[PDB]
Design an enzyme around this catalytic site. Structure first.
Site, PDB file in Angstrom:
ATOM      1  N   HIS A   1       5.515   8.050  -1.779  1.00 44.71           N
ATOM      2  CA  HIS A   1       3.998   8.302  -1.539  1.00 44.71           C
ATOM      3  C   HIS A   1       3.691   8.924  -0.208  1.00 44.71           C
ATOM      4  O   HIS A   1       2.694   9.871  -0.117  1.00 44.71           O
ATOM      5  CB  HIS A   1       3.632   7.429  -2.379  1.00 44.71           C
ATOM      6  CG  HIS A   1       1.735   6.682  -2.057  1.00 44.71           C
ATOM      7  ND1 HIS A   1       0.739   7.464  -2.668  1.00 44.71           N
ATOM      8  CD2 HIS A   1       1.316   6.341  -0.659  1.00 44.71           C
ATOM      9  CE1 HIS A   1       0.097   6.986  -2.030  1.00 44.71           C
ATOM     10  NE2 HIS A   1      -0.210   6.657  -0.704  1.00 44.71           N
TER      11      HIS A   1
HETATM   12  C1  FAD Z   1       2.355  -3.734   2.327  1.00 46.76           C
HETATM   13  C2  FAD Z   1       3.031  -3.101   1.280  1.00 46.76           C
HETATM   14  C3  FAD Z   1       3.279  -2.033   1.855  1.00 46.76           C
HETATM   15  C4  FAD Z   1       3.829  -0.754   0.932  1.00 46.76           C
HETATM   16  N1  FAD Z   1       4.574   0.540   0.766  1.00 46.76           N
HETATM   17  C5  FAD Z   1       4.555   1.295   0.220  1.00 46.76           C
HETATM   18  C6  FAD Z   1       5.353   2.461  -0.106  1.00 46.76           C
HETATM   19  O1  FAD Z   1       5.147   3.293   1.543  1.00 46.76           O
HETATM   20  N2  FAD Z   1       5.049   3.532  -0.595  1.00 46.76           N
HETATM   21  C7  FAD Z   1       5.680   3.176  -1.751  1.00 46.76           C
HETATM   22  O2  FAD Z   1       6.330   3.863  -2.942  1.00 46.76           O
HETATM   23  N3  FAD Z   1       5.395   1.450  -2.551  1.00 46.76           N
HETATM   24  C8  FAD Z   1       4.693   0.686  -1.494  1.00 46.76           C
HETATM   25  N4  FAD Z   1       4.413  -0.459  -1.705  1.00 46.76           N
HETATM   26  C9  FAD Z   1       4.869  -0.753  -2.611  1.00 46.76           C
HETATM   27  C10 FAD Z   1       3.331  -0.435  -3.835  1.00 46.76           C
HETATM   28  O3  FAD Z   1       2.266  -0.824  -3.366  1.00 46.76           O
HETATM   29  C11 FAD Z   1       3.340  -0.830  -5.417  1.00 46.76           C
HETATM   30  O4  FAD Z   1       4.585  -0.912  -5.859  1.00 46.76           O
HETATM   31  C12 FAD Z   1       2.253  -0.349  -6.447  1.00 46.76           C
HETATM   32  O5  FAD Z   1       1.039  -0.727  -5.809  1.00 46.76           O
HETATM   33  C13 FAD Z   1       2.129  -0.476  -7.625  1.00 46.76           C
HETATM   34  O6  FAD Z   1       1.326  -0.841  -8.489  1.00 46.76           O
HETATM   35  P1  FAD Z   1       0.695  -0.898  -9.603  1.00 46.76           P
HETATM   36  O7  FAD Z   1      -0.473  -0.468  -9.967  1.00 46.76           O
HETATM   37  O8  FAD Z   1       2.208  -2.074 -10.240  1.00 46.76           O
HETATM   38  O9  FAD Z   1       0.084  -2.883  -8.739  1.00 46.76           O
HETATM   39  P2  FAD Z   1      -1.167  -2.410  -7.715  1.00 46.76           P
HETATM   40  O10 FAD Z   1      -1.126  -1.155  -7.381  1.00 46.76           O
HETATM   41  O11 FAD Z   1      -1.041  -3.261  -6.911  1.00 46.76           O
HETATM   42  O12 FAD Z   1      -2.523  -3.327  -8.190  1.00 46.76           O
HETATM   43  C14 FAD Z   1      -2.809  -4.564  -9.319  1.00 46.76           C
HETATM   44  C15 FAD Z   1      -4.193  -4.684  -9.336  1.00 46.76           C
HETATM   45  O13 FAD Z   1      -4.008  -6.403 -10.309  1.00 46.76           O
HETATM   46  C16 FAD Z   1      -5.373  -6.579  -9.745  1.00 46.76           C
HETATM   47  N5  FAD Z   1      -4.496  -7.991 -10.564  1.00 46.76           N
HETATM   48  C17 FAD Z   1      -3.973  -8.896  -9.933  1.00 46.76           C
HETATM   49  N6  FAD Z   1      -3.760 -10.161 -10.856  1.00 46.76           N
HETATM   50  C18 FAD Z   1      -4.988  -9.601 -12.014  1.00 46.76           C
HETATM   51  C19 FAD Z   1      -6.026 -10.454 -12.888  1.00 46.76           C
HETATM   52  N7  FAD Z   1      -5.850 -11.518 -13.092  1.00 46.76           N
HETATM   53  N8  FAD Z   1      -6.585  -9.693 -13.928  1.00 46.76           N
HETATM   54  C20 FAD Z   1      -7.287  -8.348 -13.148  1.00 46.76           C
HETATM   55  N9  FAD Z   1      -6.806  -7.893 -12.481  1.00 46.76           N
HETATM   56  C21 FAD Z   1      -5.323  -8.279 -11.535  1.00 46.76           C
HETATM   57  C22 FAD Z   1      -5.158  -7.048  -8.203  1.00 46.76           C
HETATM   58  O14 FAD Z   1      -5.755  -7.210  -8.352  1.00 46.76           O
HETATM   59  C23 FAD Z   1      -4.296  -4.775  -7.551  1.00 46.76           C
HETATM   60  O15 FAD Z   1      -5.357  -5.123  -7.293  1.00 46.76           O
HETATM   61  C24 FAD Z   1       3.933  -1.184  -0.584  1.00 46.76           C
HETATM   62  C25 FAD Z   1       3.882  -3.057  -0.711  1.00 46.76           C
HETATM   63  C26 FAD Z   1       2.998  -3.718   0.241  1.00 46.76           C
HETATM   64  C27 FAD Z   1       3.460  -5.075  -0.302  1.00 46.76           C
HETATM   65 AG    AG Z   2      -0.133   4.137  -2.236  1.00 42.07          AG
END
Ligand code: FAD
Ligand code: AG
Ligand code: FAD
Ligand code: NDP
Ligand code: NDP
Ligand code: AG
Ligand code: AG
Ligand code: AG
Lengths: 487, 485
Positions: free
Chosen positions: A460
């Site tokens: 990413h």
């Molecule tokens: C500090 C940090 C650095 C990272 N750096 C990298 C990186 O450099 N490269 C990489 O590939 N990955 C990285 N990651 C991992 C990556 O950010 C996640 O794996 C990615 O965001 C997953 O996407 P997702 O859509 O599944 O979850 P998310 O992108 O986190 O989306 C979750 C969303 O759902 C919402 N939500 C939660 N509960 C509810 C509910 N009850 N009802 C409605 N909405 C809700 C939240 O508010 C949140 O906005 C990092 C993670 C962290 C913590």
């Molecule tokens: Ag990102």
């Protein structure tokens, strides 16, 4: 039978590669001939060739040093605070540090010759006497003292190339890439003549190491610098060199140069203007260095600007005489000559012959915003392909909204054959491009398709991951013509 | 038929991918549910998910800021002279600029929803009611007011993951990655608990942004940080984090934490020692965020640590309910979830079904010397392969003889199947490693061999060209044994 199995004229990138290989992995009696042992301003090149002494190695060190100007300025936005008011670098301590590294490589090449048996270094100017005799003199003059007479089975020519000058009055008042490495002081008022690799690269160096109120003017004969490169990359680079300080000056060429009462040079251009420059560097070109080698005496075919006529296996007009690297004028790069040298060894001493693949060779331009290209441009792919798709993507790395350098725009342009989907060229501009283009060159040598790119899950927070985000082509080329749609 | 075609719980990396795709390239009525619109402490994540608000984006900005410490120091050798003693960065103006960038992305997503027809953003806490009804409350509490009641054909869960803490007294005195992004001041005396991704990355940030005489201590439960990574890369990082300032401490774990009469925290360790830290961050891990989604009511299976159990196409227990991203607990990355989301769209609304390839995925670790890995380690490839060759190469970039940072050693380690020469793993440590590994990942999915690498003519003054210089293997593994030859 003979004294040596091989005499290599030129201890360059290609030269030393063949020398070591024949002597170590084949146990042959190898003699390597070169001008001097350590780098130095009388005769610039040395043990290691242009590459090590007055080429890639010191260039990269200086380009890295200049790059700090941007980084020190950019650090401010991230909370790094210091005395930024007219902060200038120390050119003298750069050249000092540069020389200490170059000489260190020179020194480790000396002990290589003292420790490797079969290898022997022979200082002086080599020249051909016959099909089996190379004569070492103390000068390029054919009448100066003969230091050594080497009797050999095979002869390899790896003397590389040499800067071209333009035939105008005041030509010797100018410097080339050679003299640039040993300047006493960093010029205030700089002119870089030409629009080639060196021109653009060195423009960035001087612009990084300019003193106070200093300026670097790049002038080019035509209307867009870096002919042969992606037209859209060229335009974007021109825009970025400008934004970084370098004043680009297209459709301009010097004609008269005279020296002044303070050392500075007075330059007369095409449009009739006159400006004063402390130094004027000529990046006109590099002609193969074979004028003194007496190829006529041995009957080695000399052609386009003194280039040595070779086939696919580096063999010249005489069966035992070979030539590699810039002296052949095929593809003038360090890793090309190294490959040509390794392929030469495999052919004659290894038994199993092999030819050097000159197509789809990834190279880079170490300009302040660096370029990374491999393969064909639009113009070339549309010239000799049925139908071609053109993918494009320009984006500003997220950090640059903080750093302030919003001009720094990363650009990737993939050029594919529409029929097959085959990637025929990838062209990049921005930081990390020379690194990214390397493993792209692996893919293009594997013969990869655009479908192979956008099907790989990205990494990413990187610039390279944008290769895998290009699905829709910007436009097409249909049988030669530029079309925005394809029926 | 009914109100929406899709309700996505979570406006994340994957959530927003699936939302936009279904709505634009298929013209479906899509509802997206999330906690808030702009980044902010009380509930950290927002529109854009963790990755945008408290993830990759801000992390990278802060890692880039910290790297200037090295770069400013390194400039000296090249002739760049300035005041260097007592020179510390401004943390307050870093967070300031970080927030400005994160908020603009938040704003960019707000105008996206207002301009894309089919897409609608619904602020609040989404929770399931049945196979077709998603209820939006104002709190995670199941008894707080109901703001909306969405009636949909399909449901997609993309709520992602959440920081894990350790069950010890003084646990709530600590911070996580979430709170780290909104610290009022840069800590002088820092402790990073754990040896994972976040630990190593943030250790570098705080060490870059430490004030005078400040220090960052990293403590890890085991004896080598970053398990699952190349063991030789791990060891080389440990030395370089050390040389850069960060004091690594292995086989150590906190057990008791109490606050002092000045704010600073007093920590009781595993060996029995006690030390004082201004701040203590826990990089323990991330559990899937499904605790308050009421999957039981809809009949969705939650297995290991509440992870939403899915098949290869993201489909859950119920045929209409789907889940992607960190909530599934497959491969917790941003570009993985985006791919899972895009494939989800193709599966149901696109017609042509597609499964996400979880194997041979290139990723990176943004340590001060960054890591770039793709594929198998030594240990793993020796477990389930007949014969394996190990190629290794360590070299110091020529510039580092001038810059003074002679500790910064670039390392490449290729692990191949000895039978046909297939590249099974590539591991790197140094600058540009995350950039290089990306196009390596292109080759490994392409099914590349070691003979493809060293037959490509290099690009001379680069670090990536060394990838094409490895011909003879350092050693071998034969049927499991570490074999000399
Ligand atoms: C500090 C940090 C650095 C990272 N750096 C990298 C990186 O450099 N490269 C990489 O590939 N990955 C990285 N990651 C991992 C990556 O950010 C996640 O794996 C990615 O965001 C997953 O996407 P997702 O859509 O599944 O979850 P998310 O992108 O986190 O989306 C979750 C969303 O759902 C919402 N939500 C939660 N509960 C509810 C509910 N009850 N009802 C409605 N909405 C809700 C939240 O508010 C949140 O906005 C990092 C993670 C962290 C913590
Ligand atoms: Ag990102
Ligand atoms: C300023 C500059 C920067 C460059 N940067 C890059 C780069 O970043 N990346 C890249 O890929 N390429 C770069 N190049 C090109 C690269 O340096 C050359 O292509 C490479 O050196 C070719 O190797 P070679 O062995 O054929 O010639 P060389 O390496 O130049 O070897 C020639 C040697 O032969 C010796 N010699 C000459 N005449 C005689 C004779 N009469 N008798 C005996 N010995 C003789 C010379 O002393 C010299 O040492 C650069 C070139 C220049 C000028
Ligand atoms: N890979 C790398 O990073 C590097 C590689 N190199 C190698 O070494 C070689 C260095 O040669 P270099 O000259 O710097 O680059 P080039 O030979 O590629 O380009 C020379 C430039 O000078 C212009 N020019 C040529 N003749 C004249 C003239 N008579 N008057 C005015 N302008 C003229 C040309 O114009 P036009 O386009 O109109 O013909 C062209 O723009 C390169 O060819 C390259 O192979 C050098 C540095 C870095
Ligand atoms: N790609 C990138 O650049 C980044 C990705 N991420 C994502 O974030 C996810 C979570 O990161 P992270 O929070 O660091 O979790 P990780 O799984 O990555 O690492 C957790 C660390 O804490 C240790 N640990 C686990 N439990 C305890 C405990 N109870 N007490 C003490 N120590 C413990 C683990 O050691 P052990 O289990 O070996 O004993 C491990 O070293 C990662 O999986 C990654 O997908 C995060 C940042 C950057
Ligand atoms: Ag070189
Ligand atoms: Ag490939
Ligand atoms: Ag590839």
């Amino acid at each position: 039978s003979r004294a040596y199995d091989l005499v290599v004229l030129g201890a360059g990138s290609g030269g030393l590669e063949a020398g070591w290989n024949a002597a170590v992995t084949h146990k042959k009696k190898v003699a390597v001939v070169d001008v001097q042992a350590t780098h130095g301003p009388p005769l610039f090149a040395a043990l290691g060739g242009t590459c090590v002494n007055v080429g890639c190695v010191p260039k990269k060190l200086m380009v890295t040093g200049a790059q700090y100007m941007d980084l020190i300025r950019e650090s401010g936005g991230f909370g790094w605070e210091m005395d930024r008011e007219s902060l200038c670098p120390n050119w003298k301590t750069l050249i000092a540090a540069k020389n200490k590294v170059v000489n260190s490589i020179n020194e480790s090449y000396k002990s290589m010759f003292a420790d490797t048996e079969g290898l022997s270094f022979h200082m002086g100017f080599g020249a051909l006497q016959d099909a089996h005799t190379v004569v070492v003199r103390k000068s390029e003059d054919p009448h100066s003292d003969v230091l050594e007479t080497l009797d050999t089975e095979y002869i390899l020519i790896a003397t590389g190339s040499w800067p071209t000058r333009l035939g105008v009055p005041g030509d010797e008042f100018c410097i080339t890439s050679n003299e640039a490495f040993y300047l006493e002081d960093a010029p205030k008022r700089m002119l870089c003549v030409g629009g080639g690799y060196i021109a653009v690269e060195f423009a960035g160096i001087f612009n990084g190491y300019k003193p106070c109120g200093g300026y670097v003017d790049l002038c080019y004969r035509g209307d867009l610098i870096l002919r042969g490169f992606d037209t859209e990359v060229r335009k974007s680079l021109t825009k970025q060199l400008g934004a970084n300080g370098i004043r680009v000056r297209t459709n301009l060429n010097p004609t008269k140069i005279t020296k002044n009462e303070d050392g500075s040079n007075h330059v007369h251009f095409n449009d009739g203007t006159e400006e004063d420059y402390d130094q004027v560097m000529l990046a006109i070109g590099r002609v193969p260095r074979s004028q003194a080698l007496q190829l006529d005496k041995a009957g080695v075919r000399t052609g386009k600007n003194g280039a040595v006529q070779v086939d696919a296996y580096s063999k010249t007009s005489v069966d035992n005489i070979y030539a590699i690297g810039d002296v052949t004028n095929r593809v003038m790069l360090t890793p090309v000559a190294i490959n040509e040298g390794a392929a030469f060894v495999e052919t004659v001493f290894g038994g199993k012959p092999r030819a050097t693949d000159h197509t789809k060779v990834a190279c880079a331009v170490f300009s302040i915003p660096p370029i990374g290209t491999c393969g064909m441009t639009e113009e070339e792919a549309a010239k000799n392909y049925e139908t071609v798709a053109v993918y494009a993507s320009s984006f500003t790395p997220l950090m640059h909204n903080i750093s302030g350098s919003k001009h720094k725009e990363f650009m990737i342009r993939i050029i594919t054959n529409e029929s097959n989907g085959e990637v025929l060229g990838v062209h990049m501009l921005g930081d990390s491009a020379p690194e990214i283009i390397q493993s792209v060159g692996i893919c293009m040598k594997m013969g990869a398709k655009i479908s192979d790119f956008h099907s790989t899950i990205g990494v990413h927070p990187t610039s390279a991951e944008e290769l895998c985000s290009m699905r829709t082509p910007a436009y097409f080329y249909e049988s030669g013509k530029r079309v925005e749609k394809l029926s």
